[PDB]
Amino acid sequence: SVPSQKTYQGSYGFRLGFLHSGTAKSVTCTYSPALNKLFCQLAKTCPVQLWVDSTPPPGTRVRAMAIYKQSQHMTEVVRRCPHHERCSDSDGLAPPQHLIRVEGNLRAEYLDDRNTFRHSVVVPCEPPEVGSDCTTIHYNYMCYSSCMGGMNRRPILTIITLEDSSGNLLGRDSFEVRVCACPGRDRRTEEENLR
C-alpha cells in the first residue's frame, strides 16, 4: 500500500505554512517554496505552521508520515538507518526507528501501523494562542537523507494529515524533505538547478 499525498484543504481549509529563514550557510532549517522542499540539519527544530480557515472540532489531530518520493521506492517503509536506530538518542517517547519526531509535546503519540508497518507521529490539533493566527508544530528528522542502509540518498516526502478523533481524513498537505549538513547551501543549489 501507499499513503495518498494528494493536497486536500477540506472543510476547515487546512494547509501548512513555513517560516522564511534564508539560505545563509549557518541556517539549520530552511524551506523552499519553489521546490516545495524543506532542507534541515539532523535532529534540528523544524517549525511547521498549521493554518485553518475555521476551527476543527475538539479531538482533531495532526499526523506526520514520511514516504519515499520516487514511485519505485514508495512501498518501502521510511525508517532510520541501521546506525541511527541504535544510537540511543531516545527522547523517551519516540521509538528509536522513527525518522520523524515531534519536539516538546508530551501528548505526541507514535504509531507503528499494524498493517503497513509505516511509522507516524500524531498530536492534538490546538487552537492558536492569543495574538497568534496559526499553531506551530516542531518536527525533528533523525537521519540524513544520505544515510546508508536507510534513506540512502533517496528523496522523501512528509505527509501531514488533519484527522478527526477516529483518524478519518479532514485535510492533507505535503512537502519534500532533505536532511543534510548544509541546508542553506543545498537549497541555493537545488533552486539554481531548477532555474
CB-nearer residue toward Zn ion: 97 or 105: 97
Position 67 contacts Zn ion (CB under 5 A):
no
User: 94, 109 in Cβ contact below 8 A?
Assistant: no
Position 147 contacts Zn ion (CB under 5 A):
yes
- Of the candidate residues 84, 98, 101, 118, the single one contacting Zn ion (CB under 5 A): 84
User: 60, 165 in Cβ contact below 8 A?
Assistant: yes
147 is in an annotated binding site: yes
Position 100 contacts Zn ion (CB under 5 A):
no
The edge-to-edge listing of strands for the beta sheet with 169-179 is 29-32, 37-40, 169-179, 156-163, 61-68, 119-124, 109-112
Position 15 contacts Zn ion (CB under 5 A):
no
Q: What H or E segment, with its residue span, contains residue 140?
A: strand 135-141
Centroid of chain to Cα 150? 17
Position 178 contacts Zn ion (CB under 5 A):
no
- 22 to 61: interface string for Zn ion, x by CB under 5 A: ----------------------------------------
Position 81 contacts Zn ion (CB under 5 A):
yes
Position 101 contacts Zn ion (CB under 5 A):
no
Position 98 contacts Zn ion (CB under 5 A):
no
**Alpha carbon distance 110, 95 (integer Å):** 7
Site residue total, Zn ion (CB under 5 A): 5
User: 161, 175 in Cβ contact below 8 A?
Assistant: no
**Closest distance of CB 18 from Zn ion, Å:** 24
Tell me which residues in 124-143 interact with Zn ion (CB under 5 A).
143
134 is in an annotated binding site: no
User: 62, 162 in Cβ contact below 8 A?
Assistant: yes
User: 36, 175 in Cβ contact below 8 A?
Assistant: yes
**Where do contacts with Zn ion occur on this chain (CB under 5 A)?**
81, 84, 143, 147, 150
